[PDB]
Amino acid sequence: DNQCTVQVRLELGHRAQLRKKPTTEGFTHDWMVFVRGPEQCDIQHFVEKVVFWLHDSFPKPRRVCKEPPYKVEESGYAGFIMPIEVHFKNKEEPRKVCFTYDLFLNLEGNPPVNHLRCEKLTFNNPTTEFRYKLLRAGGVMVM
Ligand SMILES: C[C@H]1CCCN1Cc1nc2ccc(NC(=O)c3ccc4c(cnn4C)c3)cc2[nH]1
Secondary structure, eight states: OOOOEEEEEEEEEEEEEEOSSOOTTOOOEEEEEEEEOSTTOOGGGTEEEEEEEOOTTSSSOEEEESSSOEEEEEEESSOEEEEEEEEESOSSSOOEEEEEEEEOOOOTTSOOEEEEEEEEEEEESOOHHHHHHHHHTTOEEEO
16 A cells, blocks of 8 residues: 555676787786666666775775776676675665676676676665655656
8 A cells, every 4th residue: 555666677788808918917808897777877876886896816805986887897808606786775685786786797608697686676665765765766666
């Protein structure tokens, strides 16, 4: 009767390509990982920050974006599993969502990687305040 659900969408993704020539440090690959909304949505209305947890070998592996673009650009030698936390401008639970992101590179001879992973978040009965932030960002009421 006073029940209420807001869906929003997140796109996580990454690009990777073999450098024509490795770096001095033997980095064979360029890559880029990101969190964005669909086109014409503004996830910054409900997203406080995004944290990208790189392999422990990276300098400052806890990479934070407090505003768009939410992305890391790097070079490296191998793929890994990257925890990505999306923190919300939410007073209550849930405050964040954690994704296990497969950052995989192209094996030499294979063309560049260009992957997208679409995530639908369903917020049940958000506070009036946080409901407003979700709708500002291009979220939708359901149910
Ligand atoms: C462009 C500049 C901006 C600051 C730093 N970056 C250069 C730069 N500094 C690095 C330090 C470490 C690594 N490590 C890896 O590439 C890496 C990936 C997967 C791995 C391992 C070991 N096991 N597995 C599964 C290592 C990459 C780096 N790239």
